[PDB]
């Protein structure tokens, strides 16, 4: 077998990116300031964190074992619980005491045959009394919200019709449905997309099979009252390339950014319309909604080149690290239109941004508040000379959060400091009668001075001030998505406005 290294080497596991790999508890976290005493619930987040050194050099960040953190809040006190998802990969590698799964989404490089290749490392959501740890090449893994024990791969009582479950399901705050899909839904290289939904009682509602014009990456999607929308990143999969040891994904400069629109209820596969946006990268969706005219307003991060530069085109063509900016775009789509090309989007702000969140009480409906990560290169915002040598590589950087009020156009920015960077934020309603976007924002910080993590709590009335700073004595390696589960929401999701 390729030899198993006994310590981590390479930029993707150096500095702040060095895996810690701890599971367990740290109760009664240290707090500077004061956590509002009325906050009650749990912030769950997932990070890729390789449990064992990979036999693949420079294995991307996206390929690390999912480790779940829960921060449990009550009466101004907070406890941390942390535990790895017991994926098939995790369990078999722990038994062997070495890495066995190979390149990102390429089973032809695995040292043993896996049934499920999930690292369950991308999102962690609440559904019907369980956590679902999500990875877009696989079904979810179900976990206990209290103990973080893994129950196992989850198939929705035998109803899951797809091999794949997106990391970005949407929760309709009025119908209480979970709206889902999977791409490559019949296996590696397939153009099959399975669109499906579950009612609040757990029964499958929609199931529609459709065909993507290319086998392209559909990382996120959008849901409105009457439509579902599938933006395709121009990364394309060729299984023959994979069989020779090549990458699952390869950029294609010759295609548009396709945007599929399907009717939300009762459609067939042939009802999808593949609109053609100008070539670019489909980033995360903030939210989509239908306006007065029935036109879809789709608000999402959008870049003009390949954000995932390590997967360049067939000739190795692509940008360099830190070159590509993504911007907060608004695309207008009309399902009734037969004109497939779309105009350049309008842009809501100037900032280089990503990881947008809204008040999920208006998900699928008109929203007027967005919170998002920003990366500002203006001199002095980040002390790059100090941070870069301690940061390692492989992951995006954010040096602030922004809050946009869409009615007024006011933007507030939270800057944690010159030697700190942020993860994705969560929004917590002040209480069940709070106005849209009124309450608290939490965000995990990487402090490069201390080489520790911190959890900042902010009030939306003034996003520039930390109400509390929870000081962890360990690093939580840069991670992906997270969600708030409020103690007053019996089904784990907030009530509609």
Ligand X SMILES: Oc1ccc(/C(F)=C/c2cc(O)cc(O)c2)cc1
Min. distance of Cβ 119 from its own copies in angstroms?
17
Min. distance of Cβ 124 from ligand X in angstroms?
13
Alpha helices in 192-248 (DSSP H): 239-243
Ranges within 447-466 binding its own copies (CB under 8 A): 451
Min. distance of Cβ 86 from Cl ion in angstroms?
4
Three-state secondary-structure class, residue 221: coil
465: number of Cβ within 10 Å = 10
Partner from ligand X, Cl ion, its own copies, none binding residue 32, C-beta < 5-8 Å depending on class: its own copies
Taking a C-beta distance cutoff of 8 angstroms, is the pair 127, 491 a contact? no
Partner from Cl ion, its own copies, ligand X, none binding residue 86, C-beta < 5-8 Å depending on class: Cl ion
Q: Is 135 annotated as a binding residue?
A: yes
Partner from its own copies, Cl ion, ligand X, none binding residue 475, C-beta < 5-8 Å depending on class: its own copies
Gap between the Cα atoms of 403 and 358, Å rounded: 10
32: number of Cβ within 10 Å = 10
Structure tokens at 264: 């939300």
Q: What is the DSSP letter of 320?
A: P
Taking a C-beta distance cutoff of 8 angstroms, is the pair 318, 256 a contact? no
Min. distance of Cβ 465 from ligand X in angstroms?
27
Q: Which residue has the tokens 């030899």?
A: 3
Gap between the Cα atoms of 125 and 425, Å rounded: 14
Pick from 150, 212, 287, 297: which binds Cl ion (CB under 5 A)? 150
**Which CB sits closer to its own copies, 19 or 394?**
19
Pick from 480, 482, 484, 486: which binds ligand X (CB under 6 A)? 480
Stretch that binds its own copies, among 19-27, 200-208, 265-273, 317-325 (CB under 8 A): 19-27
Gap between the Cα atoms of 124 and 69, Å rounded: 10
- If one asks whether residue 18 binds its own copies (CB under 8 A), the answer comes out as yes
Structure tokens at 393: 């590589």
**Degrees to nearest 5, angle at CA 384 with 383 and 388:** 130
Neighbour-count burial of 327, counting CB atoms closer than 10 A to its CB (0-12 exposed, 13-18 middle, 19+ buried)? buried
* Sign, Cα dihedral of 333, 351, 414, 82: positive
Pick from 27, 431, 464, 465: which binds its own copies (CB under 8 A)? 27
Ranges within 416-445 binding Cl ion (CB under 5 A): none
Ranges within 78-117 binding Cl ion (CB under 5 A): 86
- If one asks whether residue 219 binds ligand X (CB under 6 A), the answer comes out as yes
Ranges within 72-131 binding its own copies (CB under 8 A): 77, 82, 94, 97
Taking a C-beta distance cutoff of 8 angstroms, is the pair 305, 318 a contact? yes
Partner from its own copies, Cl ion, ligand X, none binding residue 474, C-beta < 5-8 Å depending on class: its own copies
Partner from its own copies, ligand X, Cl ion, none binding residue 150, C-beta < 5-8 Å depending on class: Cl ion
Residues near its own copies (CB under 8 A) are 6-8, 18-28, 30-32, 51-53, 77, 82, 94, 97, 451, 471, 473-475
Residues near ligand X (CB under 6 A) are 62, 122, 135-136, 219, 283-284, 301, 354, 396, 480
Residues near Cl ion (CB under 5 A) are 86, 149-150
């Amino acid at each position: 077998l390729p030899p198993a290294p006994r310590y981590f080497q390479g930029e993707n596991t150096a500095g702040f990116m060095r895996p810690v790999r701890f599971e367990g508890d740290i109760t009664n976290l240290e707090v500077v300031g004061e956590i509002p005493k009325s906050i009650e619930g749990t912030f769950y987040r997932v990070m890729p964190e390789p449990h064992l050194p990979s036999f693949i050099p420079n294995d991307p960040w996206f390929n690390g074992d999912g480790n779940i953190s829960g921060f449990y809040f009550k009466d101004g006190h907070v406890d941390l619980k942390q535990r790895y998802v017991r994926t098939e990969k995790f369990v078999r590698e722990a038994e062997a005491r070495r890495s066995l799964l190979g390149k990102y989404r390429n089973r032809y490089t695995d040292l043993v045959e896996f049934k499920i290749r999930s690292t369950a490392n991308t999102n962690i959501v609440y559904w019907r009394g369980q956590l679902l740890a999500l990875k877009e090449d696989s079904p979810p893994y179900a976990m206990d919200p209290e103990t973080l024990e893994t129950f196992g791969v989850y198939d929705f009582d035998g109803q899951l019709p797809s091999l794949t479950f997106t990391a970005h399901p949407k929760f309709d705050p009025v119908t209480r449905e979970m709206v889902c899909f999977g791409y490559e839904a019949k296996g590696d290289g397939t153009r099959d997309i399975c669109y499906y939904s579950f009612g609040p009682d757990g029964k499958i509602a929609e199931t529609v099979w459709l065909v993507s014009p290319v086998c392209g990456m559909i990382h996120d999607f959008a849901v409105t009252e009457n439509f579902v929308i599938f933006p395709i990143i121009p990364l394309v999969c060729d299984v023959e390339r994979m069989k020779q040891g090549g990458d699952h994904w390869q950029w294609d400069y010759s295609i548009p950014m396709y945007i599929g629109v399907l009717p939300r209820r009762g459609a067939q596969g042939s009802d999808v319309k593949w609109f053609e946006a100008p070539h670019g990268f489909a980033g995360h969706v903030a939210n989509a909604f239908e306006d007065d005219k029935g036109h879809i307003q789709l608000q999402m991060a959008y870049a003009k080149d390949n954000v995932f530069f390590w997967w360049p085109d067939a000739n190795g063509k692509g940008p360099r690290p830190g070159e590509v900016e993504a911007h907060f775009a608004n695309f207008v789509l009309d399902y009734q239109s037969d004109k497939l090309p779309l105009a350049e989007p309008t842009y809501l702000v100037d900032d280089d941004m990503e990881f947008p969140r809204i008040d999920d009480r208006v998900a699928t409906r008109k929203h007027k508040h967005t919170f998002f990560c920003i990366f500002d290169r203006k001199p002095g915002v980040t002390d790059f000379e100090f941070v870069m040598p301690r940061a390692g590589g492989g992951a995006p950087m954010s040096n602030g959060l922004a809050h946009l009020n869409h009615e007024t156009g006011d933007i507030q920015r939270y800057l944690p400091g010159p030697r700190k960077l942020t993860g994705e934020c969560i929004f917590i309603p002040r209480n069940s009668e709070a106005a849209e976007g009124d309450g608290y924002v939490m965000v995990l910080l990487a402090n490069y001075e201390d080489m520790c993590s911190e959890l900042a709590v902010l009030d939306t009335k003034d996003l520039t001030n930390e109400v509390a700073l929870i000081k962890l004595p360990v690093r939580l390696r840069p991670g992906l998505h997270g969600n708030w589960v409020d103690k007053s929401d019996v089904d784990g999701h907030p009530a509609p406005l």
